[PDB]
Amino acid sequence: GQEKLYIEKELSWLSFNERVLQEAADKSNPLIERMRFLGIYSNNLDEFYKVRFAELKRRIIISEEQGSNSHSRHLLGKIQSRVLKADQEFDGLYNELLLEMARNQIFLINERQLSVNQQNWLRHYFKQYLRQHITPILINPDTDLVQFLKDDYTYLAVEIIRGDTIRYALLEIPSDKVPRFVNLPPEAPRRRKPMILLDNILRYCLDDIFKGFFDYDALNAYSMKMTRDAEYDLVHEMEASLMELMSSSLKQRLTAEPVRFVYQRDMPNALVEVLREKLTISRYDSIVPGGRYHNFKDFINFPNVGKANLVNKPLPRLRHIWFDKAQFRNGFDAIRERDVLLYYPYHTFEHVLELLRQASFDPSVLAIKINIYRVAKDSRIIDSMIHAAHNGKKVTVVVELQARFDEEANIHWAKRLTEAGVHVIFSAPGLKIHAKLFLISRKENGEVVRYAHIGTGNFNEKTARLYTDYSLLTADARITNEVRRVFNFIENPYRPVTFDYLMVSPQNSRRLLYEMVDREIANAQQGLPSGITLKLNNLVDKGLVDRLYAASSSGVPVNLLVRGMCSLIPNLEGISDNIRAISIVDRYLEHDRVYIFENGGDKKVYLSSADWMTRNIDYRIEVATPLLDPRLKQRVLDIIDILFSDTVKARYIDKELSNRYVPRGNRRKVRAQLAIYDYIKSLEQPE
Amino acid sequence: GQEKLYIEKELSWLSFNERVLQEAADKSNPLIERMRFLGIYSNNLDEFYKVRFAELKRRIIISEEQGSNSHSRHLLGKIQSRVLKADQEFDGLYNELLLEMARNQIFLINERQLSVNQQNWLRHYFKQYLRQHITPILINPDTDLVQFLKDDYTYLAVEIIRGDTIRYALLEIPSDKVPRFVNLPPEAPRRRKPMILLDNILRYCLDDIFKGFFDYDALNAYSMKMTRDAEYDLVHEMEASLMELMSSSLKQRLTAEPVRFVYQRDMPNALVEVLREKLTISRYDSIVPGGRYHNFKDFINFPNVGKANLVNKPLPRLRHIWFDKAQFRNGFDAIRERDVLLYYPYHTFEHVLELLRQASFDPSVLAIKINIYRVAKDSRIIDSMIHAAHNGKKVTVVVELQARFDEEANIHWAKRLTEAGVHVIFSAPGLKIHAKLFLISRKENGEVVRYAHIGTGNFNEKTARLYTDYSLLTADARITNEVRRVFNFIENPYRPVTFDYLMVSPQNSRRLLYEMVDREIANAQQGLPSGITLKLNNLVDKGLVDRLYAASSSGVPVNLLVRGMCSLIPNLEGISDNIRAISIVDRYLEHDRVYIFENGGDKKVYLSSADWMTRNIDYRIEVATPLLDPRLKQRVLDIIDILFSDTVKARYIDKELSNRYVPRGNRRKVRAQLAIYDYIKSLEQPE
Ligand SMILES: Nc1ncnc2c1ncn2[C@@H]1O[C@H](COP(=O)(O)OP(=O)(O)OP(=O)(O)O)[C@@H](O)[C@H]1O
Ligand SMILES: Nc1ncnc2c1ncn2[C@@H]1O[C@H](COP(=O)(O)OP(=O)(O)OP(=O)(O)O)[C@@H](O)[C@H]1O
Ligand SMILES: [Mg+2]
Ligand SMILES: [Mg+2]
Ligand SMILES: [Mg+2]
Ligand SMILES: [Mg+2]
C-alpha cells in the first residue's frame, strides 16, 4: 500500500462505534439517553471482540500457517490503537456525564463517598437484600475457577490480608438478581437523588461479608471480568480452496477459542498471577488491565431518576391505516387490493404478527412457509406457526440455527415446531439463510392465491422497535411466484433455478448488481442521466466497491448511506470524485437496505436483506425485491430523499475516518428519523 | 360393617376440605380472604382427584382383578355424594360472596351485564391486549386436540352456526399471559370497582374473533377443562405380596392413567360428542358437566380491589433474636450454646437459609448433607449446596425425585448439583425419603463438631410462610450422631443399624410407637398418671388407631390435633371414651407434627416428619426427634396448650363428620395461631 484504495472493515467498524459515542457526547440528546449510549457503545465493543476481532485473529492464523504477505500487525496495532484512544474519550464522557447528572440532582457515588448515615443504611440494606445472593468463592490450590466461573460476569476478586498472609476469594456481582443501581437515602436536603453501583456496595460491605469466618488486618477488592471468543463458525464460511486442502494443525489452531480476562489496574501482581494459573491463560489468551467497572453495557438500562426531560419523547409506532379500512375484512383483502410497504419502527410490527396469526386459523389458508434467523424470546411467530400446524395448514419453517448470537435459541425453536407437525428445514453447515421471507398460500374461490412478505430486517419483535426496516406485503404474482421458488430453492438447491425479478444470493446477486452498475456506466458515457443510490449497513465487497469506483470514474452519481463498515473511500481524485458517502447514527439503528438505479430515467428500486459484503453475495441466501408498484417506489424515494437531506445526525465518510458532521448550508435543518416519522404520520391520516 | 369402627380416609379428607370451605363462609375472616379460600378449596379438590381419588381407583382395580370383598362402590357413592353436596354449598357461598363484594363496591360482572359503554371499552381493550393471545383452534376431522391440548387449561369451545351448518373451534383462556380479572371503567358513579372474568371477555368478543374469516348466524361458547390422573406411583409403594405375583393384565390396567373432562352444562350434545371422540374418552375416562367457570383455584390470587379491611393484617415473620446476640459470631456459636427451636411461619425460614449459606463458605466446614423433598423454585438451598461444592466442602444431597407434585423439578435439581461436584443420592424406586434433615460437620479447634437440623416441614421458602413447622437446630451429639447414621443409612441400607434417640421409618417407628403407647397403657392400669397427645396432619394407620383405642379403653387420656384425614373415631362408648379429637384450619396451614407421652410424669416430646399413616411408618424414610433440652420441650408444650385451648377455629372430629365447632364454655376466647404468634413474639423480646 502507498495510497490506501480501500479501508479495513474493522477500522471502519471502529469509526462506526465512534459515531455511537458521538451520540453520548451530543448535548442535543437527552441526558439519560446519552448515558445509555455509553451502554450501547460498550456492548457494541464487547460484540466487536467476541466476533469481528475473533474472526480476524483466525484470518491471520490461517494466513500465517503457510505464510502471510499482508501486514496483519499494522492492523492490530491500529485497532488496539483506536480502541485505547476511544477508551480515553469514554472516561472523559463518563465523568463529564456524571457531573451533568449532579447538576440535574442525580448523584452516582461510590463507597468512599457515603454519609456516615447512608453507610448504616447500606449495611442494613445489604443483609436484608444482598447477602443472600453474595457467597464468597474461596480460591484454594485445588479450586478451579476455570469451570464454574461465569462468562462475562463481573467478579470482585478479594484479597484477605492477615499479617504477611494473603488469601483470595471471588465475589460474583449478581447483576442478574438485583438492580445494578440502588437508590440511597438523601443525606440532608430533599434535593438529592443519590445512587450507588452494586459493585461498590460490595466494596463497602466487604467486612460484613468476611468478618464472620475470617481473621484479617485488611480486605482489598479488585474487579474482573472473563470473556470467551465466539465459536469459530463465521471463518469457515470462506475457506474454499483453503479448507479443501487445509491442514490438521490449522483446524486445531483455528477452532481453539481463546479466553480474555480484564481486571482492575491495581490488582496486585500476585493475585493476577493466581487468576492466570486458574484460568489456564496460554499464549493466545489475553490479560488486560482496565478500570474499576466492567460491563458498562448495563448502562443501556440506566434508570431515569429525574424528569422526562432526561429521556427522548416516545415516537408511537403507527398503524398502517390501510389495514383498518372497513372495506377490508382481513389482512388479505388489504394486501390483494394494493401492495403494502411498512417502514419500522415508524410503523408497528404488529401488522405482520396479526397477519401470521390470522393465517394460522383462516380456514382458507393451506400453507405457510417462513424464515427464522433471529426471533424474539418465545416468538409469537413460533407460536402461530405451531397453531397453524395444529389447524392442519402445511407449515414449513426454515430456521437459521447458524445465526450470530440468537443461534442456540433457534435450536430449541425446533423440538416443539417438529413435534407440532411443522416441517422444519435447517441451514446447511456454512451457508446462512438471511432472507426475511414468508409465504402464505390460500384459496380464494377456487384459485390458490399467494401472499408474500419480503423484508430487510428479521421477524424480531423488540428489534422491530429499535431498527429501521421495510416489510413488503404483496399478492403480486410476479413476485409471489419467485418467493415460492426461493423456498423450493432452499429445500432443493440441486435443481437449477432462475429468477427474473428477485435478486437471490448466491444465485443472482453479483451478476445482477454488476449488470445494473454497468448499465448506469453505459448510460453516463452516452450522456444519459444516471445514478446509483445505496442504503446499506455495510459496504465491503471488493468487486462491488471497484464497480462503484468504475461508475464514479465513468461519470455516474453515486450516493451512499452506509451506517456501519464502509471500505469504499469517497472523493479520491480520479477514482471516486462522484461518490458522496454519509452515515446516519441516531435514536433508531438504521437497518434497512435499498438499491436505487436511475436506469435512464425509469428508476429501479430494490429493498434488500443483503449488505454489500462478500458473504452476502456469494456465501448466503439473501433476497432483494424490486418495487413494482410505482406508489411504493415513490414512497421509498421520498424517504431516501429525507435521509440524504439530514443535517443533524448525518456524518461524512472520508479516508481520515474523521466522522465530521455534514454542515448544513442555508438548507433546512433536517433530522431524518424525525422527518421520516412526520412523513409516515403524514401518510396515516384519515382518508 | 355394622357400626363403623374406622372412617374412610377419603371421606375424612372431604370433611377436611369442607373445613376449608367453612373458612370461606366464616364472616369473621376478611372478605377477600374468604374469596381466596374458595380458591384453596377448589385447588384442594383438584389435587384430591388427580391423586387420592386416582389412588383409590387403582386400589379397587387391584382388588377386583381376582375379586374384592370390600364395598368399593359404597365409598365412591359417598365420595361423589359429599362432593356434589359441597359443590352445591360452594355456589351458594360464591354467589353470597359476590353480593357482599357488591356491598363493598366490588362488582364482578359478566358479558351480559355490560354498559353500552364498557362493551366498547372491552372490544378496544381486547384488540389492544388480548387478541394477540387468543388464536382459534379449528376442530376438523383430522385435527386431534388429544395431543396439543393443554392439561388443566380452560378452553372455550365455540359453536359456529351458519344456517343448519355447525363448525367448532376452541379458545384457550390464556390465564398464563394475562390477568384473569380485568378492571372495567366505572359506568357512571365513581363509587364503582367493576371487574370481569377473562373468560367472559372472550364470550363478549366472540364475534370480533371470528367475523374476520367466518360467515355465521350465531356464535355460542361453552367452557371446558381437561385433566389427567396422576402417574401411578403412590399405589406401587404398597404392592408387596400382590406385586410379587402380580399379573400383566393388572400392570397395564393399573398404569393406564385415565383422562377427565368437565364441560359447561349447556354444551350441546353434538359438541360433547365431538370432544369425546377427539379425546378418546374410553370406559375408564370420565365426562362431567359442571358449570360456566372452571379453575376456581385462580381465586387464590383474587386481587384486593377495596381497602385493607378485606384482607388479613400480616403477621411479620419474627427473627429468633438468639441468633443476633452480639456474643455469637455466627450461626454455629448460637447453636453450640443452646439447641434452637423455630416454629414457622411465626419465625422466618431465613435463619435456616442463612446457616446453610454460611456453611457453604465457612472455611472450617468440611461437609454438608441435606434432604430435598420439595424445594422452592430455584432454591437458594440448591444454590448454596452448589457453592459449597465449589468451595470444596464434601456435599451430599439426598433428593426425593419421587415426591408428589414437585417431583419432575427435583430431577433437574440434579444435572447442576452433580456437575458442580455434589454427590447426589436418589430415592429408591418405591421408597420416599420424607425426613427433613441436614448435617453440617465443621472443625472447631481440632475436633469435628456436627450441627444438625431436623424438621417437620420441608426446606421450602414459600411453604415456610403458609405452613406451621418446627425446625430443630442442634449440636447435641446424642442427636447429631444419630442424624449422621440416618444419612449413612440412606446411602447404605444394607448394613444393619440401630437408633437410640431418633424414631426412623421404616426401621424404628412402629416398634417405638407401640412401645410408647403400651407404656402409657401400663401406667394407667397401675393408677399412674398417663397421656398421649398427638399433633399430626393425618391419622389413618390401622395398628396405631387400634393402639390408641387400646389406650383409651385402658384409661389413657388421648388428645389429638389432626388437621387432615383422621380415621380414628373418638367417643365411641367403650372404645374411645377418653379420646378427644379436634382439628384446626385457619390462616396458616397446620403442618407440624408432635408426639407427647406423659411417661409417668417425665414427659417425652417428639417433633416428627411423619404422619400416622401406614406409608409413613413402613414404606418411607421419616424422622422424629425427641427434645432433650427441657426448655424447648416446655416451649412446645406451651404451644400445644395454646392449640388445644382454641375456641375460634377448632373443630371437633366425630363419626358424623359434622365439623361442629368447639363451643367455648366460660373459658377464654382463644385463637391458637394468633395467640401462638403472641407467645413467640413474647419470646423474641430484647433480653
Ligand atoms: N444507534 C443504535 N441503536 C440501537 N442499537 C445499536 C445502535 N448502534 C449500535 N447498536 C447495536 O448494534 C447491533 C446491531 O446490528 P447488526 O446490524 O449486527 O444486527 P442484526 O440485528 O444482527 O442484523 P443482521 O442479522 O441483518 O446483520 C444491534 O443489535 C444493537 O444493539
Ligand atoms: N388452608 C390451606 N392453606 C394452604 N394450602 C392448603 C390448605 N388446605 C389444603 N392445602 C393444600 O393441600 C396440600 C398438602 O398438604 P400435605 O399436608 O400433603 O403437604 P406437604 O407440604 O406436601 O407435606 P408431605 O411432605 O407430608 O406430603 C398442600 O400441598 C396445600 O397446597
Ligand atoms: Mg449484519
Ligand atoms: Mg453487523
Ligand atoms: Mg405428599
Ligand atoms: Mg401432598
Curated annotation (Swiss-Prot), chains A, B:
InterPro entries xrefs: PLipase_D/transphosphatidylase, PP_kinase, PP_kinase_C_1, PP_kinase_middle, PP_kinase_middle_dom_sf, PPK_C_dom2, PPK_N_dom, PPK_N_dom_sf
Effect listed in the UniProt record for changing residue 434 to A/Q: Loss of enzyme activity
Effect of substituting residue 374 to A: Loss of enzyme activity
GO BP: any one term: polyphosphate biosynthetic process
UniProt keyword terms in alphabetical order: ATP-binding, Cell membrane, Kinase, Magnesium, Membrane, Metal-binding, Nucleotide-binding, Phosphoprotein, Transferase
Single GO molecular function: phosphotransferase activity, phosphate group as acceptor
Any one Pfam family match given in the protein's UniProt record, by short name: PP_kinase_C_1
Places the protein is found: Cell membrane
CDD domains per UniProt: PLDc_EcPPK1_C2_like, PLDc_PPK1_C1
Residues that coordinate or bind ATP: 44, 467, 563, 591
Main subcellular location: membrane
Catalytically driven reaction(s): [phosphate](n) + ATP = [phosphate](n+1) + ADP
Effect of residue 620 to A: Loss of enzyme activity
Reported modifications of this chain: An intermediate of this reaction is the autophosphorylated ppk in which a phosphate is covalently linked to a histidine residue through a N-P bond.
Entry EC number(s): 2.7.4.1
GO cellular component: cytosol; membrane; periplasmic side of cell outer membrane; plasma membrane; polyphosphate kinase complex
Residue stretches making up the PLD phosphodiesterase domain: 429-463
Role played: Catalyzes the reversible transfer of the terminal phosphate of ATP to form a long-chain polyphosphate (polyP). Can form linear polymers of orthophosphate with chain lengths up to 1000 or more. Can use GTP instead of ATP, but the efficiency of GTP is 5% that of ATP. Also exhibits several other enzymatic activities, which include: ATP synthesis from polyP in the presence of excess ADP, general nucleoside-diphosphate kinase activity, linear guanosine 5'-tetraphosphate (ppppG) synthesis and autophosphorylation.
Family: Belongs to the polyphosphate kinase 1 (PPK1) family.
Subunit structure: Homotetramer. Dimer of dimers. The diverse functions of this enzyme involve different subunit organizations and conformations.
Protein name: Polyphosphate kinase
Organism: Escherichia coli (strain K12)
Upper classification of the organism: Bacteria, Pseudomonadati, Pseudomonadota, Gammaproteobacteria, Enterobacterales
Gene: ppk
